[PDB]
PDB file as gemmi writes it, atoms N, CA and C in Angstrom:
CRYST1    1.000    1.000    1.000  90.00  90.00  90.00 P 1                      
ATOM      1  N   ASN A   1      10.641 -27.489 -37.090  1.00  0.00           N  
ATOM      2  CA  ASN A   1       9.278 -27.501 -36.572  1.00  0.00           C  
ATOM      3  C   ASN A   1       8.531 -26.234 -36.976  1.00  0.00           C  
ATOM      4  N   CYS A   2       7.335 -26.408 -37.529  1.00  0.00           N  
ATOM      5  CA  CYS A   2       6.519 -25.280 -37.959  1.00  0.00           C  
ATOM      6  C   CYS A   2       5.588 -24.823 -36.839  1.00  0.00           C  
ATOM      7  N   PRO A   3       5.208 -23.538 -36.873  1.00  0.00           N  
ATOM      8  CA  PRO A   3       4.317 -22.948 -35.869  1.00  0.00           C  
ATOM      9  C   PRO A   3       2.890 -23.475 -35.981  1.00  0.00           C  
ATOM     10  N   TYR A   4       2.298 -23.811 -34.840  1.00  0.00           N  
ATOM     11  CA  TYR A   4       0.936 -24.329 -34.809  1.00  0.00           C  
ATOM     12  C   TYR A   4      -0.081 -23.198 -34.930  1.00  0.00           C  
ATOM     13  N   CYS A   5      -0.582 -22.989 -36.142  1.00  0.00           N  
ATOM     14  CA  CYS A   5      -1.563 -21.939 -36.394  1.00  0.00           C  
ATOM     15  C   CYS A   5      -2.910 -22.536 -36.788  1.00  0.00           C  
ATOM     16  N   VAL A   6      -3.867 -21.669 -37.102  1.00  0.00           N  
ATOM     17  CA  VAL A   6      -5.200 -22.110 -37.498  1.00  0.00           C  
ATOM     18  C   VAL A   6      -5.124 -23.219 -38.540  1.00  0.00           C  
ATOM     19  N   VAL A   7      -4.077 -23.185 -39.358  1.00  0.00           N  
ATOM     20  CA  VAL A   7      -3.885 -24.188 -40.398  1.00  0.00           C  
ATOM     21  C   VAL A   7      -2.419 -24.585 -40.517  1.00  0.00           C  
ATOM     22  N   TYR A   8      -2.167 -25.889 -40.573  1.00  0.00           N  
ATOM     23  CA  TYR A   8      -0.806 -26.400 -40.683  1.00  0.00           C  
ATOM     24  C   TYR A   8      -0.054 -25.703 -41.814  1.00  0.00           C  
ATOM     25  N   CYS A   9       0.834 -24.786 -41.445  1.00  0.00           N  
ATOM     26  CA  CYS A   9       1.621 -24.046 -42.425  1.00  0.00           C  
ATOM     27  C   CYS A   9       3.101 -24.060 -42.056  1.00  0.00           C  
ATOM     28  N   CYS A  10       3.959 -23.999 -43.069  1.00  0.00           N  
ATOM     29  CA  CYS A  10       5.401 -24.004 -42.853  1.00  0.00           C  
ATOM     30  C   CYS A  10       6.071 -22.873 -43.627  1.00  0.00           C  
ATOM     31  N   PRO A  11       7.258 -22.458 -43.159  1.00  0.00           N  
ATOM     32  CA  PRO A  11       8.026 -21.382 -43.792  1.00  0.00           C  
ATOM     33  C   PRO A  11       8.594 -21.794 -45.145  1.00  0.00           C  
ATOM     34  N   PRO A  12       9.106 -20.809 -45.899  1.00  0.00           N  
ATOM     35  CA  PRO A  12       9.126 -19.409 -45.464  1.00  0.00           C  
ATOM     36  C   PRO A  12       7.731 -18.793 -45.430  1.00  0.00           C  
ATOM     37  N   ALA A  13       7.420 -18.103 -44.338  1.00  0.00           N  
ATOM     38  CA  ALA A  13       6.120 -17.463 -44.183  1.00  0.00           C  
ATOM     39  C   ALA A  13       6.021 -16.736 -42.846  1.00  0.00           C  
ATOM     40  N   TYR A  14       4.846 -16.187 -42.561  1.00  0.00           N  
ATOM     41  CA  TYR A  14       4.622 -15.462 -41.315  1.00  0.00           C  
ATOM     42  C   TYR A  14       3.167 -15.577 -40.873  1.00  0.00           C  
ATOM     43  N   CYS A  15       2.965 -16.023 -39.638  1.00  0.00           N  
ATOM     44  CA  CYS A  15       1.623 -16.179 -39.090  1.00  0.00           C  
ATOM     45  C   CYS A  15       1.113 -14.861 -38.515  1.00  0.00           C  
ATOM     46  N   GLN A  16       0.091 -14.298 -39.153  1.00  0.00           N  
ATOM     47  CA  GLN A  16      -0.488 -13.038 -38.705  1.00  0.00           C  
ATOM     48  C   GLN A  16      -1.969 -13.204 -38.382  1.00  0.00           C  
ATOM     49  N   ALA A  17      -2.631 -12.093 -38.076  1.00  0.00           N  
ATOM     50  CA  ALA A  17      -4.052 -12.115 -37.749  1.00  0.00           C  
ATOM     51  C   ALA A  17      -4.861 -12.769 -38.864  1.00  0.00           C  
ATOM     52  N   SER A  18      -4.460 -12.516 -40.106  1.00  0.00           N  
ATOM     53  CA  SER A  18      -5.152 -13.078 -41.261  1.00  0.00           C  
ATOM     54  C   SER A  18      -4.821 -14.558 -41.426  1.00  0.00           C  
ATOM     55  N   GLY A  19      -3.639 -14.949 -40.958  1.00  0.00           N  
ATOM     56  CA  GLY A  19      -3.222 -16.336 -41.063  1.00  0.00           C  
ATOM     57  C   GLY A  19      -1.825 -16.479 -41.633  1.00  0.00           C  
ATOM     58  N   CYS A  20      -1.548 -17.632 -42.232  1.00  0.00           N  
ATOM     59  CA  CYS A  20      -0.239 -17.894 -42.820  1.00  0.00           C  
ATOM     60  C   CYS A  20      -0.177 -17.391 -44.259  1.00  0.00           C  
ATOM     61  N   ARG A  21       0.730 -16.454 -44.513  1.00  0.00           N  
ATOM     62  CA  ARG A  21       0.890 -15.888 -45.847  1.00  0.00           C  
ATOM     63  C   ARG A  21       2.266 -16.223 -46.418  1.00  0.00           C  
ATOM     64  N   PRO A  22       2.394 -16.122 -47.749  1.00  0.00           N  
ATOM     65  CA  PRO A  22       3.652 -16.411 -48.447  1.00  0.00           C  
ATOM     66  C   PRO A  22       4.724 -15.364 -48.166  1.00  0.00           C  
ATOM     67  N   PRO A  23       5.971 -15.676 -48.547  1.00  0.00           N  
ATOM     68  CA  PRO A  23       7.109 -14.774 -48.347  1.00  0.00           C  
ATOM     69  C   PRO A  23       7.038 -13.543 -49.244  1.00  0.00           C  
TER      70      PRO A  23                                                      
END                                                                             
């Protein structure tokens, strides 16, 4: 299950203030 952020994003990654970014 991926984290529910401003935009449907999945790992590998990290949800930060800017949003979902790559590894």
